[PDB]
């Protein structure tokens, strides 16, 4: 007895939206709802087995509604299956952080940590396990507002059977076990990505070696800008005992307190157009 998932799946006419540019296949474009006087900036994502999986992603993405998770606007069932979502104009936080490293202050870094914890707490609320939390899967709406995305691996809660090895709890590398608490481990790796301005974790170490390194007690090192307060939070996300790791609701609180005095916790040197409507205001 779980609750009935009464989310709506919107089917969009391909005449309703005009592609504009390739971004990766993911395109950017513009969606004009049916006779409504609005233009929505949108990203658009484009065999049998593959279709089975992109519909899984659309199922999850249609079932979440939170300011820090990307929601599905709709699908389009043309000769190909397209997912339509809100355009996140600044793109990937992993790229954003590498591109502006000489320009990102402690306030932004800690606020990102809070928002990502909020998104993850919401997914935990929906008994939802992401399994691929990473800085490459956080998108940037504005520099002050990020959202978690990429739900291709999300499951509705352990688990079973390519996997992102350097972001995974040890119990997931070992037993294909996945928890909201294995997500917290991945959250820690993600925070480490942001505090190093985009370093690759265990850079140079082959994935085969990862499981034994974490078994020997080894962990990612303390980033330069990080006080022991921040780094210790990360280290707690990497406890062997999954129940010893912090809850997302607590990560929200700890990083919230730090974001009220950012410099005490991060040490960083130098602290066509009418009728356009963002998806977050088209309800
Ligand atoms: F479209 C998607 C769906 Br549907 C499901 C999952 C992910 C995506 N990717 C994106 N979503 C919204 N804005 C984006 C903006 C981007 C981008 C991807 C975006 O790539 C890099 C540069 O700028």
Swiss-Prot record:
Record domain Protein kinase: where: 17-266
Phenotype upon changing residue 24 to C: Found in a lung cancer sample
Tissue/organ expression: Ubiquitously expressed. Isoform 2 is also expressed in ovarian cancers.
Reported effect, residue 14 to K: Found in a lung cancer sample
Listed result of changing residue 128 to V: Found in a lung cancer sample; more sensitive to gefitinib than wild-type
Effect of residue 24 to D: Found in a lung cancer sample
Family per record: Belongs to the protein kinase superfamily. Tyr protein kinase family. EGF receptor subfamily.
Function: Receptor tyrosine kinase binding ligands of the EGF family and activating several signaling cascades to convert extracellular cues into appropriate cellular responses. Known ligands include EGF, TGFA/TGF-alpha, AREG, epigen/EPGN, BTC/betacellulin, epiregulin/EREG and HBEGF/heparin-binding EGF. Ligand binding triggers receptor homo- and/or heterodimerization and autophosphorylation on key cytoplasmic residues. The phosphorylated receptor recruits adapter proteins like GRB2 which in turn activates complex downstream signaling cascades. Isoform 2 may act as an antagonist of EGF action.
Subunit description: Binding of the ligand triggers homo- and/or heterodimerization of the receptor triggering its autophosphorylation. Heterodimer with ERBB2. Forms a complex with CCDC88A/GIV (via SH2-like regions) and GNAI3 which leads to enhanced EGFR signaling and triggering of cell migration; binding to CCDC88A requires autophosphorylation of the EGFR C-terminal region, and ligand stimulation is required for recruitment of GNAI3 to the complex. Interacts with ERRFI1; inhibits dimerization of the kinase domain and autophosphorylation. Part of a complex with ERBB2 and either PIK3C2A or PIK3C2B.
Protein name in the entry: Epidermal growth factor receptor
Organism: Homo sapiens (Human)
Gene name of the record: EGFR
First and last residues shown, out of full length: 696 to 1017 of 1210
């Amino acid at each position: 007895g779980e609750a009935p998932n009464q989310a709506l799946l919107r089917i969009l006419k391909e005449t309703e939206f005009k592609k504009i540019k390739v971004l990766g296949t993911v395109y950017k474009g513009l969606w004009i709802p049916e006779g409504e006087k609005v233009k929505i900036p949108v990203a658009i994502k484009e065999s049998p087995k593959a279709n089975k999986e992109i519909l899984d992603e659309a199922y999850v993405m249609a079932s979440v509604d939170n300011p820090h998770v990307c929601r599905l606007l709709g699908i389009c069932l043309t000769s190909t299956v397209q997912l339509i979502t809100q355009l996140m104009p600044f793109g990937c936080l992993l790229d954003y952080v590498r591109e502006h490293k000489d320009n990102i202050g402690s306030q932004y870094l800690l606020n990102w940590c809070v928002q990502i914890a909020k998104g993850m707490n919401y997914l935990e609320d929906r008994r939802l396990v992401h399994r691929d939390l990473a800085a490459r899967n956080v998108l940037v709406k504005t520099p002050q507002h990020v959202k978690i995305t990429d739900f291709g691996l999300a499951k509705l809660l352990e688990e079973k059977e390519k996997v992102p090895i350097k972001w995974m709890a040890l119990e997931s590398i070992l037993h294909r076990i996945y928890t909201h608490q294995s997500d917290v481990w991945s959250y820690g790796v993600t925070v480490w990505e942001l505090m190093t301005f985009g370093s690759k974790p265990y850079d140079g170490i082959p994935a085969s070696e990862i499981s034994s390194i974490l078994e020997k007690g080894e962990r990612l090192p303390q980033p330069p800008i990080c006080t022991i307060d921040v780094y210790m939070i990360m280290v707690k996300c990497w406890m062997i005992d999954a129940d010893s790791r912090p809850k997302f609701r607590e990560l929200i609180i700890e990083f919230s307190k730090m974001a009220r005095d950012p410099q005490r916790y991060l040490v960083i040197q130098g602290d066509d157009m009418d009728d356009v409507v963002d998806a977050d205001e088209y309800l």
